[PDB]
Amino acid sequence: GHMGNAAAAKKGSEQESVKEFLAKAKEEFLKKWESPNTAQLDHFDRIKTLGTGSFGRVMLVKHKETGNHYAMKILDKQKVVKLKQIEHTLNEKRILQAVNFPFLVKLEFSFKDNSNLYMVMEYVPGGEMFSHLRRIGRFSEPHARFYAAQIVLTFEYLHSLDLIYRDLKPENLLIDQQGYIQVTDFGFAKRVKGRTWTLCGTPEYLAPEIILSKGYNKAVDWWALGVLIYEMAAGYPPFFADQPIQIYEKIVSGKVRFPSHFSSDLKDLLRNLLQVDLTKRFGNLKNGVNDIKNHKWFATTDWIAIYQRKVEAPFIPKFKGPGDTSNFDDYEEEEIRVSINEKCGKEFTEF
């Protein structure tokens, strides 16, 4: 076979150890999920906007008492107007307060006021993968593989908890001071025991079943991993057009073309992730995530060493000191105005 006796027994023992880890991880998650206003706005000095989105902005803030820096996501309650907007914001808080994994951003505080919802996360100063990738063009295969391995392990963790992530893309992957990834933006994450039906995500990363208004499962995250690996290694995603409708048409077609510099191992992995037929998509088969982890493209990957952060990162961001924002792009700044009247109080009672 491909493995001799020694390698095959090592892999099996590895599989039992994964089961053991995930069983303990589920016990710890459920305790936090079942038993979850840890600050207020005036406790922080607001420094700079780090990014923007539909419902608001993320700002670097400094906690006045401790001097620690954080990334504060501010959501305007009224702008969280869409029905699926409300439920999604509650999902995001509840999931982030219960998970614990080395490649997931850590939520430290959450609170609300008359106008806004706030989620205060650890500040990750190395910037988004997005801007590093756009600046350099593309990552070499070993570099892309180092990041992809972290996503594979993160999805193995999340999916074992019946959590789907639903917004993988370089914009949502922060680079930490050791060159490892922190996944942020859990705005579309959801606990799903079987299928779910919301039409949400980012166009370039949507699996065909989402676009086709079919109920779907955690396999959409594995499709998205294929898009991410392609984009990391090529510099552009596989379904690439100026308008969403054109993007959707390419995704559903079942056609992908690869740069001539992609290795055959990489193309094989990507053809099995970017598989329209759910009975054939890696991550969705009887062997689950192991079809991905045992693929030839990952043969040099020491999964435990990645998890333990023992592997030398391909790129270490420069850091000038606490609160340095040099690795982030600039955004228009707008003052945070808090109304004297409570907005949408009934809709956000649970937050």
């Binding site: 539909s54 914009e171 949400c200 980012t202 676009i211 690439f240």
Partner: peptide, 13 residues
Amino acid sequence: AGRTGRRQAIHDI
């Protein structure tokens, strides 16, 4: 030709 800047999520396709 395709989108080269940051890509926003969609709440409804």
